Amino acid sequence: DYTHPTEMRGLSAMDLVKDMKIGWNLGNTLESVGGETGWGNPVTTKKMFDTLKAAGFNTVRIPVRWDENYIDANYTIDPAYMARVETVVNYALANDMYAIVNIHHNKFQGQFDEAHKAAIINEGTIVWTQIANHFKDYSDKLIFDTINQPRHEEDWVGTSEYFNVLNEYNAKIVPVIRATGENNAKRLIMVPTYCASSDYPKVAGMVVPNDPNVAVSIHAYIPYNLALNIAPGTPTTFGDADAAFIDKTFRMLNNTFVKKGIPVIIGQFAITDKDNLQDRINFTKFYVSTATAYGMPCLWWDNNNFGSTGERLGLLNRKNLTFPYPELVQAMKDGFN
């Protein structure tokens, strides 16, 4: 009985972004090595999305690695894999939630340099032409994100050379998507800075494509030592200096992009569990409140990890569809509203 929605309201990027609200990433799933279950998470179900919707989420980002599912030597995507991505998109769209599809951890993600520029633009063009064509009649609640964390190797600082390669990639991919037509001519497209970083050199090095319907993609697990560094002995308290760093970063993103009419989406953020629940509540409330002041939706990175090791970023326990830390969901709501 269900058919995918096709509605195109023709909203400006600013109006679309304003409607996105509180969000969530399907982490360590379709971007895993070995497919959906390759990093130990279960097969995704609609009931998981139903649970997120009932809890107050409105947007789901769906990381997708594509390059283990090429069926030939020219980046042709297996229809069965494309169909799985579409099924998961529809778990969100059937709940009237936004769904973001990207390229995430393809090998070329780490090849944003002059030595590989022609090859990465060619692969990205061929892949995005297929994704865009497959979804061209889909409603405006489907959003595309051109590349997850583009970089050279594991250089998270970057150089102008690499920043410029990314600018050329984004400047080619956006019109490639538009030219496939139908709703893709009017769909929001997200374009990242280098590494999707909010550090000022990446922000200043960014050239947003000459397209009036794009948003900048930022991933900001900040400050790093509190929010994402999992080493023992690292900071656990959310204090004045941490809040100040977040506020400065968001004011700067507002100055560079939002005040110039270009919206920003915080496509990933979180604070890792260091057995510091109250600090995580205070962090999350502060973070979302600050982002909301500048119209930036925040999408929590949920990897379904509730164990003792690794990046402890789970919110929805996917085994039984529960929230063991409901206070963190409530903190997002309290920051947003």
Side-chain angles (χ1 to χ4, degrees), residues 2-337:
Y2 171 78
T3 60
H4 67 260
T6 58
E7 177 185 51
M8 174 50 68
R9 293 166 281 179
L11 300 184
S12 66
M14 293 288 277
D15 273 350
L16 197 300
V17 171
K18 178 167 64 74
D19 198 50
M20 286 175 68
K21 309 184 189 77
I22 305 172
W24 186 92
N25 285 262
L26 185 67
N28 287 18
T29 307
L30 287 163
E31 85 283 24
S32 303
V33 174
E36 187 166 2
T37 66
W39 286 347
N41 278 333
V43 176
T44 309
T45 66
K46 184 174 179 288
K47 286 184 183 183
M48 295 173 190
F49 283 68
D50 295 348
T51 298
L52 293 169
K53 181 68 183 313
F57 293 95
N58 201 53
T59 293
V60 174
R61 179 160 177 268
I62 304 162
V64 182
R65 180 188 308 241
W66 300 90
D67 62 351
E68 302 182 323
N69 283 276
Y70 297 154
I71 68 179
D72 62 15
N74 203 42
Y75 319 122
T76 301
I77 297 160
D78 187 342
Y81 191 68
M82 186 72 76
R84 180 60 189 154
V85 174
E86 178 175 27
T87 298
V88 175
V89 165
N90 279 306
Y91 296 159
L93 297 181
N95 277 292
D96 201 38
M97 300 166 92
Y98 288 90
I100 297 158
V101 172
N102 72 3
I103 299 179
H104 201 122
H105 303 328
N106 268 45
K107 179 72 148 204
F108 83 80
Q109 183 182 255
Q111 300 182 307
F112 278 74
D113 50 57
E114 281 293 327
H116 302 86
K117 176 173 74 182
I120 74 181
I121 294 177
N122 183 60
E123 181 177 355
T125 292
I126 292 166
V127 169
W128 271 114
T129 296
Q130 290 173 84
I131 301 168
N133 278 156
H134 191 78
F135 291 100
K136 66 178 170 185
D137 79 2
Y138 268 67
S139 78
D140 61 17
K141 288 208 175 70
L142 176 62
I143 299 165
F144 295 157
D145 168 3
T146 62
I147 183 63
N148 171 52
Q149 286 176 168
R151 62 186 182 273
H152 168 80
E153 298 184 352
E154 294 296 322
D155 179 357
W156 291 75
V157 176
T159 70
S160 291
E161 176 197 328
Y162 312 151
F163 302 161
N164 172 69
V165 170
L166 173 58
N167 290 335
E168 295 187 40
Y169 173 91
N170 284 330
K172 286 287 158 291
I173 294 303
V174 167
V176 161
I177 293 163
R178 299 294 179 213
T180 66
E182 299 188 22
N183 280 356
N184 293 336
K186 292 181 183 179
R187 185 174 313 293
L188 184 70
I189 302 166
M190 296 167 59
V191 287
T193 58
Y194 183 91
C195 290
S197 182
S198 66
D199 301 317
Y200 190 71
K202 293 90 162 182
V203 168
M206 181 68 170
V207 175
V208 183
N210 186 13
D211 184 288
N213 190 21
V214 297
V216 175
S217 172
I218 295 294
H219 302 173
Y221 303 83
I222 58 169
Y224 170 74
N225 284 333
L226 174 65
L228 192 54
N229 190 340
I230 60 169
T234 54
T236 65
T237 297
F238 181 60
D240 288 347
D242 309 304
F245 187 76
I246 291 163
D247 188 78
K248 179 175 75 191
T249 298
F250 275 93
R251 287 182 184 268
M252 175 278 294
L253 290 169
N254 185 59
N255 282 342
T256 299
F257 301 119
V258 180
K259 282 170 52 173
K260 303 189 203 137
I262 301 174
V264 178
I265 294 161
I266 306 299
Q268 301 180 195
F269 87 115
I271 174 164
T272 194
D273 194 0
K274 301 182 188 186
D275 306 305
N276 58 338
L277 179 64
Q278 296 305 312
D279 292 291
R280 297 212 291 161
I281 293 167
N282 297 341
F283 172 99
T284 299
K285 170 69 186 300
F286 183 88
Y287 192 110
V288 177
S289 174
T290 302
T292 300
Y294 307 109
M296 305 178 187
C298 296
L299 290 61
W300 182 281
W301 181 262
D302 192 334
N303 62 6
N304 194 41
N305 182 14
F306 299 89
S308 54
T309 65
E311 293 181 351
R312 299 164 72 201
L313 297 172
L315 291 182
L316 173 67
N317 179 326
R318 298 184 206 168
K319 187 173 270 169
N320 63 6
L321 310 182
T322 61
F323 294 96
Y325 316 119
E327 303 91 339
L328 294 180
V329 178
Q330 190 61 49
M332 295 184 214
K333 291 175 178 177
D334 291 347
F336 182 77
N337 296 293

